[PDB]
Write an enzyme that holds these catalytic residues in place. Structure first.
Site, PDB file in Angstrom:
ATOM      1  N   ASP A   1     -13.463   8.763  -8.222  1.00  0.00           N
ATOM      2  CA  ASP A   1     -14.558   9.006  -7.294  1.00  0.00           C
ATOM      3  C   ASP A   1     -14.345  10.125  -6.291  1.00  0.00           C
ATOM      4  O   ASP A   1     -15.105  10.241  -5.340  1.00  0.00           O
ATOM      5  CB  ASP A   1     -14.972   7.723  -6.562  1.00  0.00           C
TER       6      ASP A   1
ATOM      7  N   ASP B   1      -6.673   8.227  -0.521  1.00  0.00           N
ATOM      8  CA  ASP B   1      -6.160   7.184   0.375  1.00  0.00           C
ATOM      9  C   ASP B   1      -5.050   7.832   1.201  1.00  0.00           C
ATOM     10  O   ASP B   1      -4.172   8.516   0.659  1.00  0.00           O
ATOM     11  CB  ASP B   1      -5.622   6.007  -0.432  1.00  0.00           C
TER      12      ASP B   1
ATOM     13  N   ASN C   1      -7.875   9.548  -5.892  1.00  0.00           N
ATOM     14  CA  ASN C   1      -8.573   8.701  -6.855  1.00  0.00           C
ATOM     15  C   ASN C   1      -9.478   9.606  -7.686  1.00  0.00           C
ATOM     16  O   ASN C   1     -10.587   9.944  -7.263  1.00  0.00           O
ATOM     17  CB  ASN C   1      -9.398   7.653  -6.110  1.00  0.00           C
TER      18      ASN C   1
ATOM     19  N   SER D   1     -12.125  10.555  -3.947  1.00  0.00           N
ATOM     20  CA  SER D   1     -11.708  10.166  -2.607  1.00  0.00           C
ATOM     21  C   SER D   1     -10.179  10.116  -2.589  1.00  0.00           C
ATOM     22  O   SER D   1      -9.550  10.064  -3.641  1.00  0.00           O
ATOM     23  CB  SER D   1     -12.324   8.805  -2.238  1.00  0.00           C
TER      24      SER D   1
ATOM     25  N   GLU E   1       0.797  -1.219   0.000  1.00  0.00           N
ATOM     26  CA  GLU E   1       0.000   0.000   0.000  1.00  0.00           C
ATOM     27  C   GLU E   1       0.844   1.290   0.000  1.00  0.00           C
ATOM     28  O   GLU E   1       0.637   2.175  -0.822  1.00  0.00           O
ATOM     29  CB  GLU E   1      -0.937   0.024   1.211  1.00  0.00           C
TER      30      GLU E   1
ATOM     31  N   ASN F   1      -9.001   4.903   3.018  1.00  0.00           N
ATOM     32  CA  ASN F   1      -9.862   5.733   2.182  1.00  0.00           C
ATOM     33  C   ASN F   1     -10.828   6.692   2.885  1.00  0.00           C
ATOM     34  O   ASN F   1     -11.564   6.316   3.816  1.00  0.00           O
ATOM     35  CB  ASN F   1     -10.618   4.840   1.195  1.00  0.00           C
TER      36      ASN F   1
END
Ligand SMILES: [Cl-]
Ligand SMILES: [Cl-]
Ligand code: NA
Length: 130
Positions: free
Chosen positions: A49, A53, A46, A51, A35, A60
């Protein structure tokens, strides 16, 4: 902060991650590795959408933390996403524990499925003394 492998391994054990909700420490190490590369300040937007991380576990903003700019998002960990960018991973660990309390468990992160599931994850903790 960019943690060294065994330093992180020992840290997670002390924070009670070994076997949390049935997830072995080596799985958590495999997850942090794929990750963020063990980097606490890693952030990923992202475009799809709206959002983002955050942190070492790339948690998220749509479900776990609040950053104020993600549409129709909730804050299940009851944290500012800023807390997930600290060098001290106590908050990130408490939020990660909250995430796996949901039914999907560790499967909530697609990265775990792609690179850790059904693999020999022992390598991530070998020689670390945990
Ligand atoms: Cl906070
Ligand atoms: Cl907040
Ligand atoms: Na949120």
């Amino acid at each position: 902060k960019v943690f060294e492998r065994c330093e992180l391994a020992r840290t997670l054990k002390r924070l009670g991650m070994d076997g949390y909700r049935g997830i072995s420490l080596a799985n958590w190490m495999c997850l942090a590795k794929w990750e963020s590369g063990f980097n606490t300040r890693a952030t990923n937007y992202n475009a799809g959408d709206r959002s983002t991380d955050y942190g070492i576990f790339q948690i998220n903003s749509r479900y776990w933390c609040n950053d104020g700019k993600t549409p129709g998002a909730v804050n299940a960990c009851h944290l500012s996403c800023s807390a997930l960018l600290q060098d001290n991973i106590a908050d990130a660990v408490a939020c990660a524990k909250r995430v796996v309390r949901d039914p999907q468990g560790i499967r909530a992160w697609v990265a775990w499925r792609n690179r850790c599931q059904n693999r020999d994850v022992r390598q991530y903790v070998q020689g670390c003394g945990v």
